[PDB]
Chains A and B, each alone.
Chain A
């Protein structure tokens, strides 16, 4: 049909953001450090390089900023390789938007 070869692709999947570092004086850009709870398999991190993490910016749920901004980054590289990974965000995030569950 689809000719399943395929690959797999599944949404799962939650993770948490450890903390986002926005630094300058003027040489560095920005870092975000990410922890998926268990997930991607050593094979499925490795085969890949290239996770998109899309997190909805959903009311969470006092009155939140409910906006039509869903943000999706890309995972650069493991640093943590059997767990934790480095990530970057391209728009830049919401407020202190550290914490909130990360998903694909």
Chain B
């Protein structure tokens, strides 16, 4: 039904927290093809369904493949969750054509938050995870749980995740304490609110 994340003429920020990596990538590839400029944030907190060993073997067949065969130059394998997401986008888009390459170059994937995009990130129409590993439904694996077993960028990324989360928790806690104060004096001035002839036909359309 209406896809409630999707089009905006310009936006584009996507929350990856416990979203499904290939499902999020599929919408992101479509927004990128449409000419959007897409920033996926919290790539460390994104999820892939399936049992850890079987996810670990897929990537690992790339990791033995990272070694050989040798000029140098690529075939290449990214250790870290934004770059794993970028590797996913560079298969989702037709990846041999200027329209596709120009769409790829409009994506960025950032780990934690970049330095501040404090306009909220938004969830994709049910991309998100809880159920899609179903209760049970066996394991899932986080990209920041994959990339600890593959390497840095990850490691710095999860240490910067930690600090950016701790400080924005503190800054959230107090902004909420003032917002509640503003809400309470706002609601009392709607409880009061002066009168009507025209004006209360609108709250009979909530």
Contact = CB atoms under 8 A, between A and B. Distances in A.
Chain A: interface secondary structure?
loop
Given A2-B126, A74-B9, A9 B3 contact: yes
B93 to A, nearest CB: 14
A72 B36 CA distance: 13
Contacts, number: 28
Contacts of B34: 52, 72, 74, 90
Contacts of B182: none
Interface in A1-25: 2-4, 6-9
Interface residues of B, number: 11
Query: What 5 A-B pairs come out closest when comparing CB atoms?
Result: A7-B2, A6-B1, A50-B7, A9-B2, A9-B1
18 contacts: A2-B1, A2-B126, A3-B126, A4-B1, A6-B1, A6-B2, A7-B2, A7-B3, A7-B4, A8-B1, A8-B2, A9-B1, A50-B8, A50-B9, A52-B34, A72-B34, A74-B9, A90-B34
Given A8-B2, A50-B9, A90-B35, 11 more contacts: A2-B1, A2-B126, A4-B1, A6-B2, A7-B3, A7-B4, A9-B1, A50-B8, A74-B7, A90-B34, A91-B99
Interface of A: 2-4, 6-9, 49-50, 52, 72, 74, 90-91
Interface of B: 1-4, 7-9, 34-35, 99, 126
